[PDB]
Every structure is written in C-alpha cells, then in structure tokens.
Design a protein around this ligand. Structure first.
Ligand SMILES: [Ca+2]
Ligand SMILES: [Ca+2]
Length: 75
C-alpha cells in the first residue's frame, strides 16, 4: 500500500526539481539539476528529455510524470 512517508519523499524530490514552487518542471529547472550532477546539456537535449515522459503533451513535467521518471530509475 501507499504510505504518507513515501508520498513525503516523492514530494521532496519533486520540490528539489521544482525550485520556484509553481507545480511544473521547466527546461531551466531540469538544466540546473543536470549541471549540478556534472553534465552540460543544451536546451534542446533538455527538451528531448521532457518529451520522453510528457504524457499530456503540454511540454513540461508535472507530478505524475515525475513519478514515472522515478519508477524507471529505481526499477
Ligand atoms: Ca516550476
Ligand atoms: Ca506534461
């Protein structure tokens, strides 16, 4: 079953990406995190990364889409 602690961790990770707190993840926020890992992606490469998990086609990552990303990293 889903727990409130699990929910809490998910929310922490999302917020680590969503810096301005508006509930969506932009190419610029993605960029910030990827550069902190030691990579140097172009704007278009960041957009290709969004395009992989963008299930509603709106061009940015929301919470359930982020959940998909984590699903793939852990599993
Ligand atoms: Ca945001
Ligand atoms: Ca989306």
């Amino acid at each position: 079953q889903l727990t409130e602690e699990q929910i809490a961790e998910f929310k922490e990770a999302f917020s680590l990406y969503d810096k301005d707190g508006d509930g969506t993840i932009t190419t610029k926020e993605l960029g910030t995190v990827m550069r902190s890992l030691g990579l140097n992606p172009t704007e278009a490469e960041l957009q290709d990364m969004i395009n992989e998990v963008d299930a509603d086609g709106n061009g940015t990552i929301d919470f359930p889409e982020f959940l998909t990303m984590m699903a793939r990293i852990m599993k």
